[PDB]
């Protein structure tokens, strides 16, 4: 599963999960997708390379399995092509 996508950065998160800090971005391709990382800022037109992850988690209320898809970058890159 590989994704190569062009879009604009709509939101930036300095986050934390599983005892590891991460930086995430919202890519507004209008649909959107999250890019997770292990010069890019709000408003940038970027080209992203990385593994598409479905990242399924169980909802607390509905008890349903849902996708929370993201493009992982480690191989991967994020290139500002504005």
């Amino acid at each position, epitope marked *: 599963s590989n994704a190569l996508m062009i879009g604009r950065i709509a939101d930036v998160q300095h986050g934390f*999960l599983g005892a590891m800090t991460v930086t995430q971005y919202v890519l507004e391709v209008k649909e959107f997708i999250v890019i997770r990382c292990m010069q890019v800022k709000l408003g940038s037109r970027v080209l992203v390379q990385g593994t598409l992850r479905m990242n399924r988690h169980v909802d607390d209320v509905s008890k349903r399995l849902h996708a929370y898809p993201f493009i992982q970058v480690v191989l991967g890159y994020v290139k500002v092509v504005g």
Partner: nanobody
Amino acid sequence: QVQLQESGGGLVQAGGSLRLSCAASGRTSSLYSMGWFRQAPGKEREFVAAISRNGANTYYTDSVKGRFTISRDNAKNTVELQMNSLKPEDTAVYYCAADRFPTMEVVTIMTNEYDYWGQGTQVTVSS
């Protein structure tokens, strides 16, 4: 569109405990990470504790680790902060905040990335 309501604060003695609650109403469907923040009178607003939308990942500022516990219930749209072993240094106005960043499991650990803020509830610790 979104209203945040803090409750449960007030006055306590050193070593004592309080439980702060934050109820969220309006379009809560756009809320993800929830966090507690504080402002001592005269200083910058600072991160205390935060929790992800699914409640699987939590984060704490170093000086409240082992004393403070954050939790949430998504059916009631509330985030809670159990404050134990309180110190004079913890005296501040406490705010609950919400982030719009659409993520399930990742907790937002940066103050300026939070979008929604409540009016605040005063917490005073004396010896």
